[PDB]
Scaffold this active site. Structure first.
Site, short mmCIF file in Angstrom:
data_model
loop_
_atom_site.label_atom_id
_atom_site.label_comp_id
_atom_site.label_asym_id
_atom_site.label_seq_id
_atom_site.Cartn_x
_atom_site.Cartn_y
_atom_site.Cartn_z
N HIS A 61 21.91 -9.27 -11.24
CA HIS A 61 23.01 -10.25 -11.37
C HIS A 61 23.82 -10.03 -12.65
O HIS A 61 25.03 -10.28 -12.66
CB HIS A 61 22.47 -11.69 -11.34
CG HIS A 61 21.58 -11.97 -10.17
ND1 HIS A 61 22.05 -12.00 -8.87
CD2 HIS A 61 20.26 -12.25 -10.10
CE1 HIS A 61 21.05 -12.28 -8.05
NE2 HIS A 61 19.95 -12.42 -8.77
N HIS A 91 23.33 -12.43 -22.26
CA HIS A 91 23.89 -11.65 -21.18
C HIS A 91 25.37 -11.94 -21.13
O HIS A 91 25.87 -12.79 -21.86
CB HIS A 91 23.25 -12.03 -19.84
CG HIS A 91 23.44 -13.46 -19.48
ND1 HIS A 91 22.57 -14.45 -19.89
CD2 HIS A 91 24.43 -14.08 -18.80
CE1 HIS A 91 23.01 -15.62 -19.45
NE2 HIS A 91 24.15 -15.42 -18.80
N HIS A 93 29.02 -12.16 -18.32
CA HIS A 93 29.67 -12.17 -17.00
C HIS A 93 31.01 -11.48 -17.20
O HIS A 93 31.66 -11.66 -18.24
CB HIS A 93 29.88 -13.60 -16.49
CG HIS A 93 28.62 -14.41 -16.49
ND1 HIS A 93 27.87 -14.62 -15.35
CD2 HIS A 93 27.94 -15.01 -17.50
CE1 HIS A 93 26.80 -15.34 -15.65
NE2 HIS A 93 26.81 -15.57 -16.95
N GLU A 103 33.61 -17.26 -17.06
CA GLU A 103 33.19 -18.38 -16.23
C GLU A 103 33.94 -19.63 -16.67
O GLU A 103 34.66 -20.24 -15.86
CB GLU A 103 31.67 -18.54 -16.35
CG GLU A 103 30.94 -17.30 -15.88
CD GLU A 103 29.56 -17.60 -15.35
OE1 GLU A 103 28.71 -18.05 -16.12
OE2 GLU A 103 29.30 -17.38 -14.16
N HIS A 116 26.93 -15.15 -23.01
CA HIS A 116 26.05 -16.32 -23.06
C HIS A 116 24.80 -16.02 -23.86
O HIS A 116 23.99 -15.17 -23.45
CB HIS A 116 25.65 -16.75 -21.65
CG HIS A 116 26.79 -17.30 -20.87
ND1 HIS A 116 26.79 -17.40 -19.50
CD2 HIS A 116 27.98 -17.80 -21.29
CE1 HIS A 116 27.94 -17.91 -19.10
NE2 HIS A 116 28.67 -18.18 -20.17
N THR A 195 24.79 -21.50 -14.72
CA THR A 195 25.93 -21.10 -13.89
C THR A 195 25.52 -20.19 -12.74
O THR A 195 26.38 -19.75 -11.97
CB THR A 195 27.03 -20.39 -14.70
OG1 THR A 195 26.52 -19.12 -15.16
CG2 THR A 195 27.51 -21.26 -15.87
N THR A 196 24.23 -19.88 -12.62
CA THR A 196 23.70 -19.18 -11.43
C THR A 196 22.56 -20.02 -10.88
O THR A 196 21.99 -20.84 -11.60
CB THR A 196 23.13 -17.78 -11.76
OG1 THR A 196 21.82 -17.91 -12.33
CG2 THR A 196 24.02 -16.98 -12.69
N1 LIG Z 1 16.28 -17.16 -12.65
C1 LIG Z 1 16.54 -18.03 -13.69
C2 LIG Z 1 15.55 -18.87 -14.17
C3 LIG Z 1 15.82 -19.74 -15.22
C4 LIG Z 1 17.08 -19.77 -15.79
C5 LIG Z 1 18.08 -18.93 -15.31
C6 LIG Z 1 19.44 -18.96 -15.92
C7 LIG Z 1 19.58 -18.99 -17.30
C8 LIG Z 1 20.84 -19.02 -17.87
C9 LIG Z 1 21.97 -19.02 -17.06
S1 LIG Z 1 23.59 -19.06 -17.78
N2 LIG Z 1 24.49 -17.98 -17.00
O1 LIG Z 1 23.46 -18.61 -19.14
O2 LIG Z 1 24.14 -20.36 -17.53
C10 LIG Z 1 21.83 -19.00 -15.68
C11 LIG Z 1 20.57 -18.97 -15.11
C12 LIG Z 1 17.81 -18.06 -14.26
ZN LIG Z 2 25.49 -16.73 -18.05
#
Ligand SMILES: Nc1cccc(-c2ccc(S(N)(=O)=O)cc2)c1
Ligand SMILES: [Zn+2]
Ligand SMILES: Nc1cccc(-c2ccc(S(N)(=O)=O)cc2)c1
Length: 257
Positions: A61, A91, A93, A103, A116, A195-196
């Protein structure tokens, strides 16, 4: 499973993750004129001097640069936050084109990418417990625009060829995330979500006003990554962003006038 394609993208996620249509979903558009200066908001405290990066992972992802979060080594405090939040990973996007990728948006403007830096509230003991709490995570979001190179990003860019496909990881020690920050720590903040999937409503979002500049060559290398695993048809890892979600009953606060 879920992804960013025509058949598994953001408009499909609600079928497996009904919270996708929840009351505090992210990202959102930041309407700069409607965001209110909150003079009670504290300066952000970013303490990354003792950070220990360990590994970089292509998870199908995005790619995660992972940190040792078994001690208070790299922490975010202050701002809207109560308590201490430990850096676990960062990470990005990004888009297929320079005109999209972020995002969050700012007065509907999309940036080329968004960084992020993910932190968890230490009062909950570990990351898995923290994501089950409304104040479990603090994510520091930083916009990327295309212009001059970001020298502190180059070590990340240069390892990407070694983690081209889903499930690949590489040692990634001694990376200093302070080299990814802009000069100013002025920010907007609001309560939101991952956000995922699983889209959990556990995040205090802190989005920096000042973007960082990265070069066209730097972002082009992001775009050479693959969503697919090794030995599968190549699908470029591009446009791994969720669009803006309804603000609903939320106020975005600004740390600055
Ligand atoms: N698979 C998984 C498990 C726990 C947290 C996450 C997760 C963590 C951070 C984010 S984000 N893109 O930084 O909002 C999105 C998803 C993903
Ligand atoms: Zn993110
Ligand atoms: N084409 C295809 C085949 C098998 C599964 C899926 C699929 C799987 C999961 C989801 S989602 N976004 O998690 O609801 C959406 C689509 C899509």
């Amino acid at each position: 499973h879920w992804g960013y394609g025509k058949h598994n993208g953001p408009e499909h996620w609600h079928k497996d993750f009904p919270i996708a249509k929840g009351e505090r979903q992210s990202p959102v558009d930041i309407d700069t004129h409607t965001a209110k200066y909150d003079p009670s908001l504290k300066p952000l405290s970013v303490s990354y001097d003792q950070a220990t990066s360990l590994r970089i992972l292509n998870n199908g992802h995005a790619f995660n640069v992972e940190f040792d979060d078994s001690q208070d080594k790299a922490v975010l405090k202050g701002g809207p936050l109560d308590g201490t939040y430990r850096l676990i990973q960062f990470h990005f996007h990004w888009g297929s084109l320079d005109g999209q990728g972020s995002e969050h948006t700012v007065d509907k403007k999309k940036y080329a990418a968004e960084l992020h830096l993910v932190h968890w509230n230490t009062k909950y003991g570990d990351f898995g417990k923290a994501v089950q709490q409304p104040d479990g995570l603090a994510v520091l979001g930083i916009f990327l625009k295309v212009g001059s190179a970001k020298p502190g990003l180059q070590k990340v860019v240069d390892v990407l060829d070694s983690i081209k496909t889903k499930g690949k990881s590489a040692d990634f020690t001694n990376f200093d995330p302070r080299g990814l920050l802009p000069e100013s720590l002025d920010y907007w903040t609001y309560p939101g979500s991952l956000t995922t999937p699983p889209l959990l409503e556990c995040v205090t979002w802190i989005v920096l006003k000042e973007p960082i500049s990265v070069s066209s060559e730097q972002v082009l290398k992001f775009r050479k990554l693959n969503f697919n695993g090794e030995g599968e048809p190549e699908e470029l890892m591009v446009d791994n962003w969720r669009p803006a979600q309804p603000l609903k009953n939320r106020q975005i606060k600004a740390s600055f006038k």
